[PDB]
Ligand binder design. Structure first.
Ligand code: HEM
Ligand code: HEM
Ligand code: HEM
Ligand SMILES: [Fe+2]
Ligand SMILES: [Fe+2]
Ligand SMILES: [Fe+2]
Ligand SMILES: [Fe+2]
Ligand SMILES: [Fe+2]
Ligand SMILES: [Fe+2]
Lengths: 157, 160, 162, 162, 162, 161
């Protein structure tokens, strides 16, 4: 079996993108744990684990399609100091991931490929859930207050 | 099998330092528990027991080298009224402990002694972890405010 | 709710005394363990822990009275080379403790304070038991002979199995 | 507490090196598993997780010293077709890491910093063990023959129940 | 990769020393057991096994560096009739080992080699503990008297783990 | 109660031989484990422990008879590069031990001492079993080939299950 070059390019772009997502999420989790916000650190660690589960599925698929996975390059990684910056950065990265996923799903469905379309659909659903959570947390922080939101997450054990 | 007098005096000085730390930490734990800040009291108790382990291993080591540990003299022990003063006091005390530990490690390693250097290294790592915790707690209380942090640490769950 | 200064000073003196006893007992236990005598080492460790409970309850009580405990002052600490010197030193320490406890109990009960008198009574009973043990051990070693006496505490005879 | 830039840059270089090792090891594990050789895939997975722990410890230490870990820089990642190429690439990576680790521990111990030296020592021991394993495996395959060596690592079974 | 001859010869000398210690300790344990002194025999057996572990780890380390372990030559092994001679012989061999270990770790650390230095530190700590035990036992028998000391190790073991 | 010098010297030289045997066997086991042949390493370790138990019982018997065991002298220890050299060295050691054992048991039984003869018989049986195993392993290596035998004996220390 030989896949089209376009679907290989789409899969490689997704792989690179969520490798970048992995690096960003793990760094943010470490920073939050260092600052003393334990529960946020646990949630971010879980999110990173889910993300590179996605990455493993993607590389397995592209390897099955008789291609060369790309591990050398990665996109830009951004970091923030306050919680708002981290939330906004994650929002933007998963947003562009969602847009690329939709475009790739359409093209791959048109190109008589099905299984890769299904894995793209599953990834899209997971990213949608994540961005929903991020938006909820952002508006909660905006309504409540930075100090109160930080106080309700401190553990000190 | 006798050791050098300089390493013995270094060990004695560190023993006195961690004994003073023991006393200060226990007093602060009792004072915090009196006012109702339960979680801080538990953490301070645990830290006092850690400094106890420091002191016990240190006196065992100096006694092995045919020395005379002194349990007589103490350094100045300071107390605070609010949380910031006690945090600052602990920070400064094991800050100077860290400095003395580094200098002693260098001299002792240069003087052809290894095991004492190793126990000094372990103690140094522990004190570095503790001062990191103190600094992050100080930054947290500075950002949040005294009332909010105190409310976070309040338990009020006494059985009766 | 404020206590009289005399009661506070009595509590502080007793706290200092039991802290000094803590230090002396722990040092003696460590020295005996290093020498090679084990049963004496564990018994001295237990006694040090008992005096540590003494100190904890004392500081709790004085703190309840809106007082200020002091952890700076410390009495003279004495050490010995042979077993007899250690026994005599501990005997003298707890003797002084007993005398101070009796005087404080009398004054404190005379000045309308009961709970502190009760904790002093409990501490006095414990100190009396300890000094009784010290005296009987000293008589035993004097009768038996030093070498023959300490031939008993030391042992390597696989005590782990049971 | 503050750290001088030399220790920070040494730790950052080691962090990037271990990240590159993570990527290369996992890619090789996936490739070997796809080819049909299973035990090699399991061993490579374990090695990738070990380097993963290394990286986590390194970034924790960097953050403790009030530094700025970087997750952007990445070294060159190389891949191979036959088993010999993979083993040679891993051997080169480990050799470079060992040399850098030795230079770094020397420099940072000469400037009064001990804990960082200790974590460097632990990492150095682990990478030394790994390169020893790679060398002995390479000697084994060179002596035995490629096909005969591969015949002992393949297995045919359904999805393994873990 | 490959080590310089100096570290190799240091490790070989230490290996020979620990082999000689193994032989001497086991012979002393057997002789003590034959005479009826029980606990001394099992303590010496435990010491023999500890030196066995020392030799094994040293052999692994030297073999890692592409060297040739020396299992042929031995130093001088000495025996004693009474307990004092055995204790003094063990003290002598431990002192020699301690001095050689210190010189070796200094030289090895001064030439960019850390892991072997760490194994030397571990061995040094263990032998220091052993010589401390020997010294305190010698002082104890000197104070107590040979016959009275021997009377406390003859019997009364009763090992019943269950 | 003390025995004759001849039996004690026989026992002493047998003790020296067994000590040399355990040294050689342990060194060979370490070399084989380092090279990557795990199962051979396990078998060699078991054999070394067996011979070193032999040495323990022999020195116990020597001490019972009011003698002086010697732990100072040693015989020549030989090492090999490939499997064939190791097997041949072990075979030679066992052959020498068997010959000495037979001569010693005959001589010492002819002089009214049977318990030492019995321990010699037990050791003789054990060493005979060992040399039989070595011979059959050498025959297998000759029949199959150096590479095929090693491919059979190697294993991957995955430790991930
Ligand atoms: C990029 C930097 C990453 C770091 C530092 C990291 C960190 C970790 C850590 C600390 C563990 C647990 C190790 C333990 O508990 O002993 C783990 C587990 C795991 N990681 Fe990540 N992670 C990263 C991204 C990745 C990567 C690169 C992979 C590669 C496949 C991945 C997939 C997994 C999987 C499958 C597990 C096991 C989870 C399970 O068995 O349920 N994640 N990771
Ligand atoms: C000043 C020298 C001190 C020494 C040598 C010392 C020694 C010890 C040791 C070794 C333990 C055992 C802890 C464990 O096994 O986890 C212990 C427990 C304890 N310490 Fe300290 N400590 C000291 C300071 C203090 C002081 C001044 C107090 C005052 C009250 C104190 C209160 C306690 C208590 C309440 C315990 C628990 C006792 C028990 O569980 O029975 N400590 N001490
Ligand atoms: C030279 C005369 C020796 C005598 C009389 C002797 C005696 C013994 C005996 C009877 C055992 C019990 C074995 C078992 O229960 O399976 C033992 C333990 C052991 N022996 Fe020796 N042995 C000698 C030399 C050696 C040497 C040089 C080594 C080198 C490594 C060695 C390796 C071991 C090991 C690894 C153990 C077990 C230790 C453990 O499990 O942690 N033997 N010794
Ligand atoms: Fe994602
Ligand atoms: Fe401390
Ligand atoms: Fe008392
Ligand atoms: Fe690594
Ligand atoms: Fe040793
Ligand atoms: Fe044998």
């Amino acid at each position: 079996m030989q896949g089209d070059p376009e679907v290989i390019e789409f899969l490689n772009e997704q792989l690179t993108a969520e490798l970048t997502a992995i690096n960003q999420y793990f760094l943010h989790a470490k920073l939050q744990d260092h600052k003393g916000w334990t529960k946020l650190a646990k949630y971010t660690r879980a999110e990173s684990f889910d993300e590179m589960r996605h990455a493993e599925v993607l590389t397995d698929r592209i390897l099955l399609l008789d291609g060369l996975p790309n591990y050398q390059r990665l996109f830009h990684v951004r970091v923030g100091q306050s919680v708002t910056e981290m939330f906004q950065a994650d929002r933007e990265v998963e947003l562009e991931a969602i847009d690329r996923l939709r475009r790739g799903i359409e093209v791959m469905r048109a190109k008589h490929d099905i299984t890769s379309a299904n894995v793209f659909e599953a990834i899209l659903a997971d990213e949608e859930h994540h961005i929903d959570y991020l938006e909820t947390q952002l508006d909660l922080i905006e309504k409540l207050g930075e100090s109160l939101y930080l106080s309700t997450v401190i553990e000190q054990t």
